[PDB]
Design an enzyme around this catalytic site. Structure first.
Site, PDB file in Angstrom:
ATOM      1  N   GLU A 200       0.841  -1.198   0.000  1.00 40.87           N
ATOM      2  CA  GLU A 200       0.000   0.000   0.000  1.00 40.87           C
ATOM      3  C   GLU A 200       0.881   1.254   0.000  1.00 40.87           C
ATOM      4  OE1 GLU A 200      -3.411   2.391   2.505  1.00 40.87           O
ATOM      5  OE2 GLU A 200      -2.989   0.357   3.236  1.00 40.87           O
TER       6      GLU A 200
HETATM    7  N1  ANP Z   1     -14.806  11.627   0.830  1.00 38.52           N
HETATM    8  C1  ANP Z   1     -13.641  11.628   1.479  1.00 38.52           C
HETATM    9  N2  ANP Z   1     -12.517  11.945   0.793  1.00 38.52           N
HETATM   10  C2  ANP Z   1     -11.352  11.993   1.449  1.00 38.52           C
HETATM   11  N3  ANP Z   1     -11.111  11.773   2.746  1.00 38.52           N
HETATM   12  C3  ANP Z   1     -12.241  11.460   3.402  1.00 38.52           C
HETATM   13  C4  ANP Z   1     -13.512  11.357   2.858  1.00 38.52           C
HETATM   14  N4  ANP Z   1     -14.435  11.009   3.832  1.00 38.52           N
HETATM   15  C5  ANP Z   1     -13.718  10.925   4.924  1.00 38.52           C
HETATM   16  N5  ANP Z   1     -12.385  11.194   4.743  1.00 38.52           N
HETATM   17  C6  ANP Z   1     -11.339  11.256   5.768  1.00 38.52           C
HETATM   18  O1  ANP Z   1     -10.245  10.466   5.349  1.00 38.52           O
HETATM   19  C7  ANP Z   1     -10.203   9.229   6.099  1.00 38.52           C
HETATM   20  C8  ANP Z   1     -10.223   8.064   5.142  1.00 38.52           C
HETATM   21  O2  ANP Z   1      -9.207   8.257   4.138  1.00 38.52           O
HETATM   22  P1  ANP Z   1      -8.975   7.176   2.974  1.00 38.52           P
HETATM   23  O3  ANP Z   1      -8.087   7.751   1.934  1.00 38.52           O
HETATM   24  O4  ANP Z   1     -10.322   6.804   2.345  1.00 38.52           O
HETATM   25  O5  ANP Z   1      -8.302   5.883   3.591  1.00 38.52           O
HETATM   26  P2  ANP Z   1      -8.855   4.418   3.809  1.00 38.52           P
HETATM   27  O6  ANP Z   1      -8.848   3.702   2.518  1.00 38.52           O
HETATM   28  O7  ANP Z   1     -10.333   4.484   4.372  1.00 38.52           O
HETATM   29  N6  ANP Z   1      -7.895   3.623   4.884  1.00 38.52           N
HETATM   30  P3  ANP Z   1      -6.900   2.332   4.655  1.00 38.52           P
HETATM   31  O8  ANP Z   1      -7.682   1.065   4.817  1.00 38.52           O
HETATM   32  O9  ANP Z   1      -5.797   2.376   5.663  1.00 38.52           O
HETATM   33  O10 ANP Z   1      -6.314   2.388   3.275  1.00 38.52           O
HETATM   34  C9  ANP Z   1     -11.383   9.264   7.070  1.00 38.52           C
HETATM   35  O11 ANP Z   1     -11.038   8.692   8.327  1.00 38.52           O
HETATM   36  C10 ANP Z   1     -11.722  10.756   7.162  1.00 38.52           C
HETATM   37  O12 ANP Z   1     -10.967  11.432   8.162  1.00 38.52           O
HETATM   38 MG    MG Z   2      -6.787   3.774   1.313  1.00 41.44          MG
END
Ligand code: ANP
Ligand code: MG
Ligand code: ANP
Ligand code: MG
Ligand code: MG
Lengths: 593, 593, 102
Positions: A200
């Site tokens: 990742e």
């Molecule tokens: N629509 C959105 N776009 C970007 N960031 C967001 C959004 N909604 C929430 N977030 C914030 O960004 C975080 C999630 O980021 P993100 O890039 O989607 O990683 P993830 O895929 O959920 N995590 P991981 O499993 O470690 O890869 C959340 O905990 C919020 O603080």
């Molecule tokens: Mg992610």
């Protein structure tokens, strides 16, 4: 007179002779489904394919551009938890569950996954239909659409066989799309698979260096020395990505930086991440669970409000929350209401301590058989013997009050998240690379390579201070310049006005509206200070630290967004022979009866 | 009880896991357009493709089967001659024509070729629609249809640049088919191209050995000795193919058969005809122009009726024609009418001496600059200085009468066609391999490899004698056994009866109806005797001589017909990597805008 | 004439060895192999892919490959393997596992 007449027919044959001898460019769509912690979303990309006589078909890496990141649908963790709620009984988190018995409910898991896959498929088609023209649609539909669904921190810590069984079902759903739309989606176990924390991070490094034009095999971006070794013309930049449940720290090792035997660095060519034609680099890639925005928010409240220094008579004093701010004592989703009040959602699914409390269960084999993982949970205040509700509950606490002390907030983010006594739960991958915590990263491995910070809140921490004129427009990434600016901002009072809650800055500096996104931004501001403190403590210091959302392309317009998405595409497309065999030779035609 | 219940779900995952890991078979159509002397026809084939993970897509050579040979449309020679008739003026054969001026009429040549290509395309689609089911149609349409149009003896002797310019236009017409039918036809200069006489023969050898299961790379058909060299388990068989304008003599060299420096043999692996994994063989492949059914019929009448021994007072006595048979003195198409009469078509296009008289022109650079080619024409009674009509005309001759002497017919076929003083016109390719004539083939090169005879009339020569009980059911190919049987048959009288002309066999043996196909079969019977005489004269004699139309497959039903068609497919498909790049990676998608 | 490929692999002895020391020794060990006595005539040579410290999983995996090769359970030929109707190669005999106590 007739000399020009015969030349038209001569040109007619030359034009036709050129068409057969020359290469032909066709447009192809590429799909990367980010099956993260917070949600499962599609990312539609477009690339230029080039087919040449006796040379086959290949993708131009520089032509790879993001058209749109789709709607945020239900995460893979929720899909599997809902299946267990109905096929292993409700509150399975507090009861011992026989995994062998769940095998009779595999067709039922297929229906649960089908519902999510149909939404993602419908959304992908909606993006393609809205952005592509009729001429573009024909080229896109004829070539086929490679789909790459990769799971991250959401199901990384998922107990038993369930996660891997879901992935076998997910691939069958992709390989069998609706024939009505015409878009030929297809996948394989090499494209659609759960990706590791190191992977990742490594893909996120490949994306950053590709878009910023630092990584390339051409003479414009690379150089061959007198000993036939390809070096990149510009220094390869490292990345710090903070998601929902995990944070990645990636940086290449410059020069002959000797590392300890316990510390494991990854050579991009040796570990088959990049082809041999690309310039080689030894890269340190580590991912930390419970460090992402959502998971770190829940863990911090649990550990801070369990300490006798912060909890008195049911009132937990939080230094990362502004003066005057008040909320209920639970890790649930906080909604800042127009009347200044903080609405805390007490639903188990919406609770931010849920993934950690579900992992920290005496019924999970990773706890019952491994004492080390049990002590990791107990040190973070989670009792694996206790029921799910009791684990997420902040014992002997009613209300969380905001003290607004930034220095006390930094000190707590440090001891809890950055440098804890024992590693944070579900971090065996990090420990195996030689890093038990964030402080150990720069202590054992350091680089003079520039760093790039990614994450909604990580950028917001810098931008808010820049907007109020607390930080300079040009900000190199000075640790104490940031700590002084944030200290003045975090000490700010909250005034409930007719318009709503307003952040009143001291010494009449300025004001801004308080919402569900910026109420706890001081925890992230402290995280950035602590992170930069360790980078400045390391033997080798980065040339510059930059905060970016997306990288601007050659035309000025950004090609794609920062993350592991473009990196996973380049990991497959750059292996010319292997890509041509799976994407073009086998293709969507492999799925045919 | 529940043990069997959990096993259903366990099997559900195993079935899905097998689907992704296993290979998948899909049906693909292959098209070979025989652009021969007599006509231009499509040959629709079907093959089983196999796509495997990380192994790409390949064709099973043994699965290649002919579904149908299409309608016989206008030959490429006629298309080009019609274009010259309208754009270089009528009777261009007797006038000096400036080739440079014809370049302004290239778009006009495209329309002439378009008309023929639309007929071939319509016919191919009609075959596919009638033989394939809906499930089969989907697999066939999705993979694309590789088209291989190869020209033979028809345009092999074609003067100037015209032939090669037509091929550039033909490929564009294939690459741009009607989108209405759904069949994705595509080509390249490697598939669609004029094939040489040696290549035509070599592919015919590959077809024969593939279908008869003599050529293979598997342990069933091949064997690896203690020195890592692959040998075929069964002896590779040679072929003798007699078309419309040319005859091919192909045979592999068994053991260390030392050949002269002038004689050129072709090693299948070294000359990239067959892959390295296949067993190696040194093959003698030679093609003779003016030896095919139509061209040899015209040349024989010209040379026999120019000899003072056969022409007296305008009446040419033909030993290859039956007693009582009467026809006009010209090489035009002969139609045996129900009243016993022979209708001779005096149209230039339908005249069998036309391709030879068009080549033998003082206005053709191959004659005006090359004295050797002029003397080759003059010895075969064609004056290149004289006009086209005067060249095809049998001077001082009115009627051709049949004498029915077989021994005199053999003696004349020998001196004219088989062993002439100078080589037959347009045979530079044959002479460059070290063979000026048919007699020189077995004199300089001989093999103990079994021979296979192919050609409508070549088979008819044997079958007619077998039917009248003149030759045994089991016929090994004895030269004097054939000569005795044919001598009794050719001496037969022609009786014009109420039913029509009947061939009355001597000593009351039997009878058969006389038609436009068997009236001159005695010339072919004599050709077979002369051919077998030289094979029996050679240092090495074939193990057995067989007469076959098509090879019976493993199920009993024949897989495909004998000729260069299957050979040209195997020449491309067997090169796994190269085929996957052109047919699957580039594909029909290469043609897209 | 052909040369002698040398593969020096360290196991549990230096697996737990602290700091850089072990990896630095391996860079020196390879130079010593690549520079043998010319007097004997045997042309010894190595590379970082052959001479390197092997992991515990690798040590076990190679021991599995040795057992199945020698016992004729592992092979790509028709005598030891078989291709099913779906083009997948399976071994004719069951692959055996190993327990090595060093
Ligand atoms: N629509 C959105 N776009 C970007 N960031 C967001 C959004 N909604 C929430 N977030 C914030 O960004 C975080 C999630 O980021 P993100 O890039 O989607 O990683 P993830 O895929 O959920 N995590 P991981 O499993 O470690 O890869 C959340 O905990 C919020 O603080
Ligand atoms: Mg992610
Ligand atoms: N429908 C037919 N099928 C088979 N043979 C035919 C047919 N019509 C005519 N013939 C005979 O077979 C000859 C043509 O055979 P053919 O196999 O088509 O070779 P070709 O392609 O025309 N010649 P070449 O250019 O040397 O390859 C004619 O001269 C006839 O004697
Ligand atoms: Mg032919
Ligand atoms: Mg040992």
């Amino acid at each position: 007179d007739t000399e020009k007449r015969i030349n038209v027919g001569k040109t007619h044959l030359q034009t036709l002779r050129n068409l057969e001898t020359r290469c032909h460019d066709s447009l192809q769509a590429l799909v990367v489904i980010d099956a993260g912690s917070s949600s499962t979303r599609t990312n539609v990309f477009l690339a230029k394919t080039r087919s040449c006589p006796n040379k086959g078909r290949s993708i131009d890496p520089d032509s790879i551009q993001l058209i749109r990141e789709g709607k945020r649908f239900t995460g893979l963790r929720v899909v599997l938890e809902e299946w267990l709620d109905t096929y292993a009984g409700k509150d399975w988190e507090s009861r011992p569950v026989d995994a062998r018995l769940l095998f009779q409910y595999v067709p039922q898991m297929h229906e649960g996954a089908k519902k999510l896959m149909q939404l993602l498929e419908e959304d992908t088609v909606a993006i393609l239909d809205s952005q592509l023209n009729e001429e573009q649609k024909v080229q896109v539909k004829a070539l086929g659409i490679p789909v790459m669904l990769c799971s991250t921190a959401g199901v990384r810590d998922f107990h038993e066989w369930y996660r891997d069984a879901l992935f076998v079902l997910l691939r069958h759903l992709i390989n069998n799309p609706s024939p009505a739309h015409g878009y030929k989606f297809f996948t394989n176990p090499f494209w659609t698979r759960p990706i590791t924390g190191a992977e990742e991070g490594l893909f996120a490094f490949i994306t950053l260096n590709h878009l910023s034009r630092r990584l390339g095999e051409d003479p414009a971006r690379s150089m061959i020395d007198e000993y036939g070794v390809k070096h990149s013309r510009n220094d390869l930049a490292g990345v710090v990505e903070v998601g929902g449940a995990s944070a990645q720290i990636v940086f290449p090792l410059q020069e002959g930086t000797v590392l300890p035997s316990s510390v494991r660095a990854v050579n991009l060519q040796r570990e088959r991440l990049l082809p041999e034609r690309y310039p080689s680099a030894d890269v340190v890639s580590v991912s930390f669970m419970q460090l992402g925005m959502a998971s770190s928010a829940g863990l911090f409240l649990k550990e801070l409000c369990s300490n006798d220094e912060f909890l008195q008579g049911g009132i937990c004093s939080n230094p990362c929350l502004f003066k005057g701010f008040q909320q209920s004592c639970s890790a649930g989703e906080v909604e800042v209401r127009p009347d200044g009040s903080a609405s805390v959602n007490e639903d188990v699914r919406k609770n931010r301590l849920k993934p950690l409390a579900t992992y920290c269960s005496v019924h999970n084999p990773e706890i019952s058989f491994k004492v080390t993982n049990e002590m990791q949970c107990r040190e973070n205040s989670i009792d694996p013997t206790k029921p799910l509700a009791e684990r997420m509950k902040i014992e002997n606490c009613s209300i969380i009050e905001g003290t607004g002390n930034f220095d006390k907030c930094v000190s707590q983010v440090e001891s809890i998240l950055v440098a804890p006594k024992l590693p944070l739960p579900a971090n065996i991958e990090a420990a195996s690379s030689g890093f038990e915590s964030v402080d150990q990263v720069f202590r054992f491995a350091s680089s003079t390579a520039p760093m790039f910070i990614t994450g909604r809140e990580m950028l917001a921490s810098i931008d808010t201070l820049k907007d109020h004129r607390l930080l300079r427009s040009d900000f190199s990434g000075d640790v104490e310049e940031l700590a002084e600016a944030a200290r003045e901002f975090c000490s700010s009072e909250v005034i409930i006005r007719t318009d709503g809650p307003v952040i009143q800055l001291p010494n009449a500096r300025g004001e801004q509206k308080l919402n569900s996104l910026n109420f706890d931004l001081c925890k992230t501001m402290a995280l950035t200070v602590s992170l930069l403190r360790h980078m400045a403590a390391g033997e080798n210091q980065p040339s510059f630290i930059k905060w970016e959302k997306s990288i601007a392309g050659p035309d000025g317009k950004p090609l794609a967004d920062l993350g592991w998405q473009v990196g996973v595409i380049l990991h497959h497309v750059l292996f010319t022979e292997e890509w041509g065999r799976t994407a073009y030779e086998a293709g969507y035609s492999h799925n045919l009866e």
